[PDB]
Amino acid sequence: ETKKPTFMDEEVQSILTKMTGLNLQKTFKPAIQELKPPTYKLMTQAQLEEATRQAVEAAKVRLKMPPVLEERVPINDVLAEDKILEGTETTKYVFTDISYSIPHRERFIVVREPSGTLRKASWEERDRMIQVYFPKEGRKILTPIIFKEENLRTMYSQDRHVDVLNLCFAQFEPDSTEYIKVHHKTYEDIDKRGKYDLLRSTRYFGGMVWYFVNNKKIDGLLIDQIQRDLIDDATNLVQLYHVLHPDGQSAQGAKDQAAEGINLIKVFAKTEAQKGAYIELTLQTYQEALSRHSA
Amino acid sequence: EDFDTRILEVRNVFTMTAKEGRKKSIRVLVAVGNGKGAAGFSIGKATDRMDAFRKAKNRAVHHLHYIERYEDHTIFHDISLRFKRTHIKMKKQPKGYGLRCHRAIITICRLIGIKDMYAKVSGSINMLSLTQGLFRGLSRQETHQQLADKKGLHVVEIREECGPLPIVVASPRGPLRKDPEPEDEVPDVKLDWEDVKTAQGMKRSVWSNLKRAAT
């Protein structure tokens, strides 16, 4: 009938790609790592514009948004219950199929319990076993302590939210419960302290917006976009909100009033926005400065 | 007051005289510099050592070179020159590389203000020819602004740490050429077997890449 968009829909990806932004100085910030002497080229204005065009393409790849997945369902599947083996071993066996050319989510990893039951390994056992035999750079078999709440607050105090997400992406699977809990705790610290610019020009801005829109908490991000003269992004945010909440007070108000452009932000500010007063004020200020520039 | 002086060589030289026979004098080589590109060297001669020190250091400040530094820490490009029989090969290096050079080159580089450079001295290792060669090589280097002006093209810096981002380091002050620089399929540049032997993992020396104190 009428399906609501998904994160990977071309319409949503385009909206979130523009709201993210592309800043070549931030996207290609100098990395603190082993260095080599730089190379130099003599370029014409055309060769330089072409080299900058290629850098923009290389950045759009580096800003490719990771898909937002729902939490994985715990694995509870018994393959066999051999009761004759009950009490014959004290420790359980984990068997991992290490055949090279198999996707890791299709690898049979089973556990023989001391009770004699042959069961499929849990998602946590699976990711641990895959790391043992197919070690991925940046991933640890034991969970790093940086992900404890006490240690994440330290990273947040230093405005290292992007590092937290890079560490979480490297350690946890996108559908893991730890991956989702860490991302959500990071998105919430940004909303509470208004640190939305820390994720701009990164592949994590879209996932953050998706979280706010689905949780009906776009008031902070909408204010931040207006204070930065990003009304085009602020208008797309209210449009994305309507697309994902069609049967809402703001979406109807926009239909009844055929609102467009800045008017969408006013309609949203009155009906559904929690900080409706602070948005009108923030929006009013913008229109003034725009009139001063015009005059 | 802004200049520091360093001794490079103290030598007892002797001449033969009719009356006094074997006569003893002191030949001193000193380098001076302020750490901000202005540096020079001078020879000092005297019967007493403290007089040679005074003459050398006071004279050197009247014979200062200005040495251009890339980002005020290294040279602008690799420098390979021969002065008489002393060969000096210098390589531009990134920050944190330090001064991995002949001890005399380390001393002179600190006076100039160079923090990161590799240098290899081959042939005759003579302190005066090494010092004179060093200052010649460093004085005759082309900066990026000079390269841009000479060729009327942008000088674009590519860093692996910064990925494919093109960093314009110098642009010509005059008009900008419209014709790309010819791309010779194979350059007719002379290569050093030492650099090629090293890049191929064939240079096996127990003395290379040894752990040393910060310089």
Side-chain angles (χ1 to χ4, degrees):
Chain A
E1 299 178 3
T2 302
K3 299 186 175 181
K4 291 185 181 180
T6 53
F7 183 74
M8 301 304 300
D9 288 346
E10 306 181 13
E11 183 178 2
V12 176
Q13 289 292 287
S14 58
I15 293 169
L16 296 175
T17 298
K18 303 172 185 167
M19 300 166 64
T20 300
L22 199 151
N23 174 16
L24 284 171
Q25 308 305 325
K26 171 172 190 187
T27 297
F28 293 128
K29 206 181 300 185
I32 296 179
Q33 63 189 24
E34 288 199 7
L35 304 173
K36 296 173 190 166
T39 54
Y40 297 93
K41 280 177 175 182
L42 292 148
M43 294 195 183
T44 57
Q45 191 65 38
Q47 289 183 303
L48 177 62
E49 289 170 351
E50 185 179 11
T52 305
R53 183 192 60 76
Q54 292 178 1
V56 170
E57 301 300 333
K60 290 186 292 197
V61 174
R62 169 169 186 88
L63 299 177
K64 177 181 173 177
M65 288 177 255
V68 175
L69 306 182
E70 287 155 19
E71 207 165 295
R72 60 202 179 177
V73 184
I75 303 163
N76 291 279
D77 193 58
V78 165
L79 297 183
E81 291 176 10
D82 305 312
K83 305 178 186 181
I84 185 55
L85 299 177
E86 185 204 340
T88 58
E89 291 111 28
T90 186
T91 301
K92 64 185 179 287
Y93 289 80
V94 180
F95 300 91
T96 299
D97 186 1
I98 57 157
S99 303
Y100 184 76
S101 62
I102 303 180
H104 291 325
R105 289 158 183 274
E106 305 192 319
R107 297 181 169 282
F108 270 88
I109 306 171
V110 296
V111 179
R112 179 70 76 173
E113 299 271 26
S115 64
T117 290
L118 186 67
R119 66 169 177 80
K120 294 186 180 155
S122 74
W123 279 121
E124 299 75 12
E125 289 167 314
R126 289 189 64 83
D127 292 359
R128 185 151 47 77
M129 287 312 108
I130 296 163
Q131 182 58 21
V132 168
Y133 302 110
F134 303 90
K136 178 181 165 63
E137 183 64 13
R139 187 163 296 193
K140 293 286 168 181
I141 282 151
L142 305 179
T143 303
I145 58 169
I146 191 66
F147 299 111
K148 294 177 179 186
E149 300 181 11
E150 292 76 22
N151 295 320
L152 291 174
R153 292 197 296 270
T154 290
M155 296 276 283
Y156 298 154
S157 301
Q158 307 172 9
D159 295 1
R160 290 175 71 191
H161 300 68
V162 170
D163 284 329
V164 173
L165 301 174
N166 288 318
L167 289 174
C168 171
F169 189 90
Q171 183 58 29
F172 302 115
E173 282 300 277
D175 49 347
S176 185
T177 309
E178 298 88 349
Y179 180 107
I180 294 158
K181 168 180 175 186
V182 170
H183 276 243
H184 289 2
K185 198 190 180 196
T186 305
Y187 299 155
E188 275 155 358
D189 183 296
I190 282 163
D191 195 66
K192 175 176 170 182
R193 301 202 297 156
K195 299 291 181 179
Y196 311 98
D197 195 72
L198 292 183
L199 267 63
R200 284 200 182 87
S201 185
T202 64
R203 67 177 181 180
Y204 303 110
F205 192 81
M208 185 186 64
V209 177
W210 195 250
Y211 173 74
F212 292 151
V213 176
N214 290 340
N215 290 260
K216 300 183 174 184
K217 52 174 65 155
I218 65 150
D219 310 81
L221 178 59
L222 196 68
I223 289 161
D224 183 72
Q225 287 164 332
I226 299 168
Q227 290 177 353
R228 294 174 177 278
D229 309 351
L230 301 163
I231 289 282
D232 187 54
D233 295 355
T235 300
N236 288 17
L237 182 52
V238 173
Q239 288 175 343
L240 184 63
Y241 186 95
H242 293 163
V243 175
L244 293 156
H245 297 287
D247 307 315
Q249 295 155 27
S250 60
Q252 298 299 314
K255 284 165 57 176
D256 302 357
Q257 302 173 36
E260 291 182 340
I262 288 170
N263 298 328
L264 291 167
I265 302 168
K266 292 181 179 179
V267 177
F268 172 81
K270 302 170 190 179
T271 66
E272 287 194 44
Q274 308 192 356
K275 302 189 145 186
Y278 203 94
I279 291 169
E280 299 285 19
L281 175 56
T282 301
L283 184 63
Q284 182 182 342
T285 293
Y286 164 84
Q287 286 171 310
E288 297 176 2
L290 199 69
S291 308
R292 295 194 189 84
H293 284 130
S294 179
Chain B
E1 302 104 346
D2 200 356
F3 282 81
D4 180 52
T5 302
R6 293 284 169 170
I7 301 169
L8 301 173
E9 185 188 72
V10 179
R11 189 178 282 241
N12 293 340
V13 291
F14 293 86
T15 188
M16 293 287 296
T17 57
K19 292 193 182 173
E20 295 178 351
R22 195 156 172 276
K23 181 212 186 191
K24 182 178 173 291
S25 166
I26 310 292
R27 188 184 79 190
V28 178
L29 178 55
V30 316
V32 299
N34 65 345
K36 301 187 291 294
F41 69 96
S42 187
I43 294 168
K45 272 261 201 68
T47 300
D48 181 58
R49 194 182 304 102
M50 305 310 306
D51 303 332
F53 291 155
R54 183 195 66 251
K55 295 177 191 183
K57 86 174 173 173
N58 293 347
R59 189 171 187 281
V61 279
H62 305 313
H63 295 89
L64 294 169
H65 308 245
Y66 185 80
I67 306 299
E68 288 281 13
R69 299 171 296 159
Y70 171 85
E71 289 178 358
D72 291 342
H73 79 90
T74 189
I75 57 175
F76 271 95
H77 53 84
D78 291 0
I79 296 164
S80 169
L81 86 156
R82 192 192 67 260
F83 183 95
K84 296 183 171 181
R85 294 283 89 207
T86 305
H87 303 76
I88 318 177
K89 177 156 208 301
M90 291 181 276
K91 297 174 184 165
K92 175 179 190 292
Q93 296 294 346
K95 296 186 174 180
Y97 185 90
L99 298 172
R100 295 176 46 187
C101 312
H102 185 292
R103 63 195 191 173
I105 299 175
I106 294 168
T107 292
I108 291 165
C109 282
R110 294 197 180 110
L111 295 172
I112 296 165
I114 293 162
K115 284 79 169 185
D116 310 284
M117 199 176 71
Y118 174 87
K120 181 69 180 83
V121 185
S122 280
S124 166
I125 316 297
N126 182 264
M127 195 60 56
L128 187 53
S129 294
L130 174 54
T131 307
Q132 200 159 0
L134 186 66
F135 276 94
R136 172 178 286 212
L138 292 175
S139 63
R140 289 175 184 188
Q141 57 181 340
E142 177 164 59
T143 68
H144 288 144
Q145 190 61 68
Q146 290 170 22
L147 183 64
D149 298 352
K150 175 167 72 189
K151 294 188 172 294
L153 296 170
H154 289 287
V155 183
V156 181
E157 184 182 63
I158 302 301
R159 299 191 156 187
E160 300 191 44
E161 52 168 327
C162 303
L165 180 64
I167 305 138
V168 181
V169 290
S171 306
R173 300 215 187 80
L176 181 60
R177 267 169 54 187
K178 294 276 177 178
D179 52 302
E181 189 77 36
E183 295 176 36
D184 190 2
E185 302 174 60
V186 191
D188 194 0
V189 301
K190 305 206 173 178
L191 304 173
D192 197 6
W193 172 232
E194 291 166 54
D195 293 334
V196 169
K197 189 169 48 169
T198 306
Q200 288 168 199
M202 287 169 62
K203 175 55 173 168
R204 303 222 297 183
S205 184
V206 302
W207 299 101
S208 299
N209 313 312
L210 288 182
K211 298 180 182 189
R212 295 178 191 255
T215 61

PDB file of all heavy atoms in Angstrom, chain B residues 78-80 89-91 93 118-120 190-203:
ATOM      1  N   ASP B  78      65.577  17.283  -1.890  1.00  0.00           N
ATOM      2  CA  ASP B  78      66.814  16.530  -1.759  1.00  0.00           C
ATOM      3  C   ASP B  78      67.959  17.288  -2.415  1.00  0.00           C
ATOM      4  O   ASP B  78      67.819  17.829  -3.516  1.00  0.00           O
ATOM      5  CB  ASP B  78      66.673  15.147  -2.391  1.00  0.00           C
ATOM      6  CG  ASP B  78      65.741  14.242  -1.616  1.00  0.00           C
ATOM      7  OD1 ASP B  78      65.198  14.687  -0.585  1.00  0.00           O
ATOM      8  OD2 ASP B  78      65.556  13.081  -2.033  1.00  0.00           O
ATOM      9  N   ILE B  79      69.098  17.328  -1.732  1.00  0.00           N
ATOM     10  CA  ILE B  79      70.282  18.040  -2.199  1.00  0.00           C
ATOM     11  C   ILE B  79      71.412  17.031  -2.315  1.00  0.00           C
ATOM     12  O   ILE B  79      71.758  16.360  -1.335  1.00  0.00           O
ATOM     13  CB  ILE B  79      70.670  19.189  -1.255  1.00  0.00           C
ATOM     14  CG1 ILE B  79      69.567  20.248  -1.223  1.00  0.00           C
ATOM     15  CG2 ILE B  79      71.991  19.805  -1.692  1.00  0.00           C
ATOM     16  CD1 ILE B  79      69.672  21.205  -0.061  1.00  0.00           C
ATOM     17  N   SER B  80      71.981  16.915  -3.511  1.00  0.00           N
ATOM     18  CA  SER B  80      73.146  16.073  -3.749  1.00  0.00           C
ATOM     19  C   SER B  80      74.192  16.909  -4.466  1.00  0.00           C
ATOM     20  O   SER B  80      73.961  17.363  -5.591  1.00  0.00           O
ATOM     21  CB  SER B  80      72.780  14.837  -4.574  1.00  0.00           C
ATOM     22  OG  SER B  80      73.940  14.163  -5.021  1.00  0.00           O
ATOM     23  N   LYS B  89      74.978  13.992   0.374  1.00  0.00           N
ATOM     24  CA  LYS B  89      73.635  13.704  -0.108  1.00  0.00           C
ATOM     25  C   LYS B  89      72.662  13.959   1.031  1.00  0.00           C
ATOM     26  O   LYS B  89      72.717  13.279   2.060  1.00  0.00           O
ATOM     27  CB  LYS B  89      73.523  12.262  -0.602  1.00  0.00           C
ATOM     28  CG  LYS B  89      72.125  11.876  -1.051  1.00  0.00           C
ATOM     29  CD  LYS B  89      72.140  10.720  -2.037  1.00  0.00           C
ATOM     30  CE  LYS B  89      70.940  10.774  -2.965  1.00  0.00           C
ATOM     31  NZ  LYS B  89      69.649  10.722  -2.221  1.00  0.00           N
ATOM     32  N   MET B  90      71.768  14.925   0.842  1.00  0.00           N
ATOM     33  CA  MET B  90      70.787  15.308   1.844  1.00  0.00           C
ATOM     34  C   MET B  90      69.392  15.011   1.318  1.00  0.00           C
ATOM     35  O   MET B  90      69.127  15.155   0.121  1.00  0.00           O
ATOM     36  CB  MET B  90      70.905  16.794   2.195  1.00  0.00           C
ATOM     37  CG  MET B  90      72.175  17.151   2.943  1.00  0.00           C
ATOM     38  SD  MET B  90      72.272  18.896   3.380  1.00  0.00           S
ATOM     39  CE  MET B  90      72.927  19.592   1.868  1.00  0.00           C
ATOM     40  N   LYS B  91      68.507  14.574   2.211  1.00  0.00           N
ATOM     41  CA  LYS B  91      67.139  14.230   1.853  1.00  0.00           C
ATOM     42  C   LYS B  91      66.160  15.020   2.706  1.00  0.00           C
ATOM     43  O   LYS B  91      66.314  15.097   3.928  1.00  0.00           O
ATOM     44  CB  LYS B  91      66.884  12.728   2.018  1.00  0.00           C
ATOM     45  CG  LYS B  91      67.725  11.858   1.107  1.00  0.00           C
ATOM     46  CD  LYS B  91      67.542  10.387   1.420  1.00  0.00           C
ATOM     47  CE  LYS B  91      68.463   9.525   0.569  1.00  0.00           C
ATOM     48  NZ  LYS B  91      68.582   8.130   1.078  1.00  0.00           N
ATOM     49  N   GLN B  93      62.886  15.497   4.757  1.00  0.00           N
ATOM     50  CA  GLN B  93      62.243  14.541   5.644  1.00  0.00           C
ATOM     51  C   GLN B  93      61.037  15.168   6.325  1.00  0.00           C
ATOM     52  O   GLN B  93      60.953  16.394   6.446  1.00  0.00           O
ATOM     53  CB  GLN B  93      63.225  14.035   6.711  1.00  0.00           C
ATOM     54  CG  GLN B  93      64.400  13.252   6.151  1.00  0.00           C
ATOM     55  CD  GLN B  93      63.982  11.943   5.517  1.00  0.00           C
ATOM     56  OE1 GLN B  93      62.861  11.477   5.709  1.00  0.00           O
ATOM     57  NE2 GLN B  93      64.890  11.334   4.766  1.00  0.00           N
ATOM     58  N   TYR B 118      67.903  13.911   6.658  1.00  0.00           N
ATOM     59  CA  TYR B 118      68.886  12.849   6.534  1.00  0.00           C
ATOM     60  C   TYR B 118      70.017  13.329   5.638  1.00  0.00           C
ATOM     61  O   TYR B 118      69.777  14.001   4.630  1.00  0.00           O
ATOM     62  CB  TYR B 118      68.270  11.572   5.959  1.00  0.00           C
ATOM     63  CG  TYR B 118      69.298  10.502   5.674  1.00  0.00           C
ATOM     64  CD1 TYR B 118      69.686   9.607   6.659  1.00  0.00           C
ATOM     65  CD2 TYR B 118      69.886  10.392   4.422  1.00  0.00           C
ATOM     66  CE1 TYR B 118      70.628   8.632   6.406  1.00  0.00           C
ATOM     67  CE2 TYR B 118      70.828   9.421   4.159  1.00  0.00           C
ATOM     68  CZ  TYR B 118      71.196   8.545   5.155  1.00  0.00           C
ATOM     69  OH  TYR B 118      72.135   7.574   4.899  1.00  0.00           O
ATOM     70  N   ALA B 119      71.249  12.997   6.012  1.00  0.00           N
ATOM     71  CA  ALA B 119      72.409  13.325   5.201  1.00  0.00           C
ATOM     72  C   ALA B 119      73.401  12.178   5.252  1.00  0.00           C
ATOM     73  O   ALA B 119      73.558  11.527   6.288  1.00  0.00           O
ATOM     74  CB  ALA B 119      73.082  14.618   5.673  1.00  0.00           C
ATOM     75  N   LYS B 120      74.066  11.933   4.127  1.00  0.00           N
ATOM     76  CA  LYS B 120      75.130  10.946   4.039  1.00  0.00           C
ATOM     77  C   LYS B 120      76.349  11.599   3.409  1.00  0.00           C
ATOM     78  O   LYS B 120      76.251  12.187   2.330  1.00  0.00           O
ATOM     79  CB  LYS B 120      74.702   9.728   3.218  1.00  0.00           C
ATOM     80  CG  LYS B 120      75.764   8.646   3.115  1.00  0.00           C
ATOM     81  CD  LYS B 120      75.999   7.955   4.444  1.00  0.00           C
ATOM     82  CE  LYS B 120      77.056   6.873   4.319  1.00  0.00           C
ATOM     83  NZ  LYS B 120      78.432   7.427   4.415  1.00  0.00           N
ATOM     84  N   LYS B 190      69.417  10.881 -13.601  1.00  0.00           N
ATOM     85  CA  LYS B 190      70.427   9.983 -13.065  1.00  0.00           C
ATOM     86  C   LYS B 190      70.043   9.548 -11.658  1.00  0.00           C
ATOM     87  O   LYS B 190      69.644  10.368 -10.826  1.00  0.00           O
ATOM     88  CB  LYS B 190      71.791  10.670 -13.049  1.00  0.00           C
ATOM     89  CG  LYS B 190      72.212  11.219 -14.401  1.00  0.00           C
ATOM     90  CD  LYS B 190      73.722  11.306 -14.530  1.00  0.00           C
ATOM     91  CE  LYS B 190      74.131  11.703 -15.938  1.00  0.00           C
ATOM     92  NZ  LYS B 190      75.605  11.846 -16.077  1.00  0.00           N
ATOM     93  N   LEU B 191      70.170   8.251 -11.394  1.00  0.00           N
ATOM     94  CA  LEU B 191      69.794   7.674 -10.113  1.00  0.00           C
ATOM     95  C   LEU B 191      71.037   7.263  -9.339  1.00  0.00           C
ATOM     96  O   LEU B 191      72.076   6.940  -9.922  1.00  0.00           O
ATOM     97  CB  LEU B 191      68.883   6.457 -10.295  1.00  0.00           C
ATOM     98  CG  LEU B 191      67.598   6.685 -11.091  1.00  0.00           C
ATOM     99  CD1 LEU B 191      66.884   5.367 -11.325  1.00  0.00           C
ATOM    100  CD2 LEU B 191      66.692   7.672 -10.371  1.00  0.00           C
ATOM    101  N   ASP B 192      70.914   7.276  -8.018  1.00  0.00           N
ATOM    102  CA  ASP B 192      71.978   6.847  -7.120  1.00  0.00           C
ATOM    103  C   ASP B 192      71.752   5.384  -6.766  1.00  0.00           C
ATOM    104  O   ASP B 192      70.686   5.022  -6.257  1.00  0.00           O
ATOM    105  CB  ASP B 192      72.004   7.708  -5.858  1.00  0.00           C
ATOM    106  CG  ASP B 192      73.313   7.596  -5.102  1.00  0.00           C
ATOM    107  OD1 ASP B 192      74.245   6.937  -5.609  1.00  0.00           O
ATOM    108  OD2 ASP B 192      73.408   8.163  -3.994  1.00  0.00           O
ATOM    109  N   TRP B 193      72.755   4.548  -7.037  1.00  0.00           N
ATOM    110  CA  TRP B 193      72.614   3.121  -6.775  1.00  0.00           C
ATOM    111  C   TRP B 193      72.311   2.849  -5.307  1.00  0.00           C
ATOM    112  O   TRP B 193      71.664   1.848  -4.983  1.00  0.00           O
ATOM    113  CB  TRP B 193      73.884   2.387  -7.205  1.00  0.00           C
ATOM    114  CG  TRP B 193      73.908   0.949  -6.807  1.00  0.00           C
ATOM    115  CD1 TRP B 193      74.897   0.306  -6.127  1.00  0.00           C
ATOM    116  CD2 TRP B 193      72.892  -0.029  -7.060  1.00  0.00           C
ATOM    117  NE1 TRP B 193      74.564  -1.013  -5.943  1.00  0.00           N
ATOM    118  CE2 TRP B 193      73.337  -1.244  -6.506  1.00  0.00           C
ATOM    119  CE3 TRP B 193      71.651   0.006  -7.702  1.00  0.00           C
ATOM    120  CZ2 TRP B 193      72.586  -2.413  -6.573  1.00  0.00           C
ATOM    121  CZ3 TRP B 193      70.908  -1.154  -7.768  1.00  0.00           C
ATOM    122  CH2 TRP B 193      71.376  -2.347  -7.207  1.00  0.00           C
ATOM    123  N   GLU B 194      72.764   3.725  -4.407  1.00  0.00           N
ATOM    124  CA  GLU B 194      72.479   3.537  -2.989  1.00  0.00           C
ATOM    125  C   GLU B 194      70.986   3.656  -2.705  1.00  0.00           C
ATOM    126  O   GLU B 194      70.420   2.839  -1.971  1.00  0.00           O
ATOM    127  CB  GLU B 194      73.264   4.555  -2.162  1.00  0.00           C
ATOM    128  CG  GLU B 194      74.762   4.320  -2.169  1.00  0.00           C
ATOM    129  CD  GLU B 194      75.544   5.507  -1.645  1.00  0.00           C
ATOM    130  OE1 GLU B 194      75.255   5.962  -0.518  1.00  0.00           O
ATOM    131  OE2 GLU B 194      76.447   5.987  -2.362  1.00  0.00           O
ATOM    132  N   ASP B 195      70.331   4.669  -3.277  1.00  0.00           N
ATOM    133  CA  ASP B 195      68.890   4.812  -3.092  1.00  0.00           C
ATOM    134  C   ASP B 195      68.138   3.647  -3.722  1.00  0.00           C
ATOM    135  O   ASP B 195      67.182   3.126  -3.137  1.00  0.00           O
ATOM    136  CB  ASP B 195      68.411   6.135  -3.687  1.00  0.00           C
ATOM    137  CG  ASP B 195      68.947   7.336  -2.941  1.00  0.00           C
ATOM    138  OD1 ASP B 195      69.250   7.203  -1.737  1.00  0.00           O
ATOM    139  OD2 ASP B 195      69.068   8.414  -3.559  1.00  0.00           O
ATOM    140  N   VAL B 196      68.554   3.225  -4.916  1.00  0.00           N
ATOM    141  CA  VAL B 196      67.870   2.127  -5.588  1.00  0.00           C
ATOM    142  C   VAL B 196      68.123   0.818  -4.855  1.00  0.00           C
ATOM    143  O   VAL B 196      67.208   0.007  -4.670  1.00  0.00           O
ATOM    144  CB  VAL B 196      68.315   2.052  -7.061  1.00  0.00           C
ATOM    145  CG1 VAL B 196      67.824   0.766  -7.707  1.00  0.00           C
ATOM    146  CG2 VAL B 196      67.808   3.263  -7.821  1.00  0.00           C
ATOM    147  N   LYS B 197      69.366   0.585  -4.430  1.00  0.00           N
ATOM    148  CA  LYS B 197      69.674  -0.625  -3.679  1.00  0.00           C
ATOM    149  C   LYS B 197      68.878  -0.696  -2.384  1.00  0.00           C
ATOM    150  O   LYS B 197      68.470  -1.785  -1.965  1.00  0.00           O
ATOM    151  CB  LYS B 197      71.171  -0.681  -3.381  1.00  0.00           C
ATOM    152  CG  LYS B 197      71.637  -1.999  -2.788  1.00  0.00           C
ATOM    153  CD  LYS B 197      73.156  -2.105  -2.757  1.00  0.00           C
ATOM    154  CE  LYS B 197      73.804  -0.851  -2.185  1.00  0.00           C
ATOM    155  NZ  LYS B 197      75.254  -1.046  -1.909  1.00  0.00           N
ATOM    156  N   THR B 198      68.643   0.448  -1.738  1.00  0.00           N
ATOM    157  CA  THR B 198      67.885   0.451  -0.492  1.00  0.00           C
ATOM    158  C   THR B 198      66.404   0.202  -0.741  1.00  0.00           C
ATOM    159  O   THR B 198      65.779  -0.605  -0.044  1.00  0.00           O
ATOM    160  CB  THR B 198      68.085   1.778   0.239  1.00  0.00           C
ATOM    161  OG1 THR B 198      69.485   2.031   0.407  1.00  0.00           O
ATOM    162  CG2 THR B 198      67.408   1.743   1.599  1.00  0.00           C
ATOM    163  N   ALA B 199      65.823   0.882  -1.733  1.00  0.00           N
ATOM    164  CA  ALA B 199      64.403   0.714  -2.014  1.00  0.00           C
ATOM    165  C   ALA B 199      64.066  -0.714  -2.414  1.00  0.00           C
ATOM    166  O   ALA B 199      62.907  -1.124  -2.290  1.00  0.00           O
ATOM    167  CB  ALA B 199      63.966   1.677  -3.118  1.00  0.00           C
ATOM    168  N   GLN B 200      65.049  -1.476  -2.888  1.00  0.00           N
ATOM    169  CA  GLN B 200      64.851  -2.858  -3.293  1.00  0.00           C
ATOM    170  C   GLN B 200      65.188  -3.842  -2.181  1.00  0.00           C
ATOM    171  O   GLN B 200      65.218  -5.052  -2.426  1.00  0.00           O
ATOM    172  CB  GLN B 200      65.701  -3.165  -4.526  1.00  0.00           C
ATOM    173  CG  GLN B 200      65.196  -2.521  -5.803  1.00  0.00           C
ATOM    174  CD  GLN B 200      66.201  -2.582  -6.942  1.00  0.00           C
ATOM    175  OE1 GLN B 200      66.102  -1.824  -7.904  1.00  0.00           O
ATOM    176  NE2 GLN B 200      67.168  -3.489  -6.844  1.00  0.00           N
ATOM    177  N   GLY B 201      65.445  -3.354  -0.969  1.00  0.00           N
ATOM    178  CA  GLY B 201      65.765  -4.240   0.130  1.00  0.00           C
ATOM    179  C   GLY B 201      67.080  -4.966  -0.024  1.00  0.00           C
ATOM    180  O   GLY B 201      67.281  -6.004   0.609  1.00  0.00           O
ATOM    181  N   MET B 202      67.985  -4.445  -0.852  1.00  0.00           N
ATOM    182  CA  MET B 202      69.267  -5.089  -1.101  1.00  0.00           C
ATOM    183  C   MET B 202      70.399  -4.513  -0.264  1.00  0.00           C
ATOM    184  O   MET B 202      71.450  -5.152  -0.150  1.00  0.00           O
ATOM    185  CB  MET B 202      69.634  -4.964  -2.584  1.00  0.00           C
ATOM    186  CG  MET B 202      68.817  -5.855  -3.500  1.00  0.00           C
ATOM    187  SD  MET B 202      69.036  -5.455  -5.244  1.00  0.00           S
ATOM    188  CE  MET B 202      70.784  -5.780  -5.454  1.00  0.00           C
ATOM    189  N   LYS B 203      70.213  -3.333   0.321  1.00  0.00           N
ATOM    190  CA  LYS B 203      71.235  -2.713   1.158  1.00  0.00           C
ATOM    191  C   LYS B 203      71.155  -3.324   2.550  1.00  0.00           C
ATOM    192  O   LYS B 203      70.234  -3.025   3.317  1.00  0.00           O
ATOM    193  CB  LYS B 203      71.035  -1.201   1.199  1.00  0.00           C
ATOM    194  CG  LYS B 203      71.968  -0.453   2.142  1.00  0.00           C
ATOM    195  CD  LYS B 203      73.434  -0.750   1.863  1.00  0.00           C
ATOM    196  CE  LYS B 203      74.345   0.140   2.695  1.00  0.00           C
ATOM    197  NZ  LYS B 203      75.765  -0.307   2.665  1.00  0.00           N
TER     198      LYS B 203
END
